[PDB]
Each structure stands twice: as C-alpha cells, then as structure tokens.
Design a binder for this molecule. Structure first.
Ligand SMILES: *SCCS(=O)(=O)O
Length: 106
C-alpha cells in the first residue's frame, strides 16, 4: 500500500516536487468506472513492487478542475512525471502497457 490520494492541485504540485528525481505515476480514475475498477488492484500491487516509483491517485469526479488541466478525456488515464515534467502518458486499463511504461521511464 504505497498509493497516495491527491485531493487538490495544491497537493498535486507539492507531491510532484516532493518526488525529487523519482518517476511519478498518476492514475486518473473514477469510482463508477468499470475499466478503472479492473486495473485498480494491479495499480496498487505495482506500488509495493516499484518502491523507487511514486504512485498517485486522482478521482476525476472530485478534481474536475485538475482532470481538465491534465487533459484527461477518458479513464483510466496514466500520466508519468520526472522532476517537474510530463515524460509519458496513455489512456486505457492496459496492465501490460502500464508496467512496460513504468520500466521504460524508471
Ligand atoms: S497534469 C498537470 C497539469 S498542469 O498543472 O502542469 O498544467
């Protein structure tokens, strides 16, 4: 259990800076979203397998402001960060592409 919930743009930007030189994975999801429910367990399992990666969760229903600014059109969308920079992104509950993108950027 290493996934921290992001409830604000304040928290988001604080979390990104707190990350330092570590890869940051953000899961944009919703509670009513089927594909999101499928991959949620795996996303969380990945958090305590990739200890040198920072895992975050954003509920797009709570943070409609942030989801817009981040250009989430559908979920789950996964967005990847290093320093203060977006270094990767895909949308889809694709277990294979998620771990692959983690490895291709850590
Ligand atoms: S996903 C982050 C959007 S913004 O705050 O960097 O513009």
């Amino acid at each position: 259990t290493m996934v921290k919930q992001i409830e604000s743009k304040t928290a988001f930007q604080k979390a990104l800076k707190a990350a330092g030189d570590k890869l940051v994975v953000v899961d944009f999801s919703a509670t009513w979203c089927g594909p999101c429910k499928m991959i949620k367990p795996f996303f969380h399992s990945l958090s305590e397998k990739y200890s040198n990666v920072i895992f975050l969760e954003v509920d797009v229903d709570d943070c409609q402001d942030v989801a817009s600014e981040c250009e989430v059109k559908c979920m789950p969308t996964f967005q990847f960060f290093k320093k203060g920079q977006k270094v990767g992104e895909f949308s889809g509950a694709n277990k294979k592409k998620l771990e692959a993108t983690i490895n291709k950027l850590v």
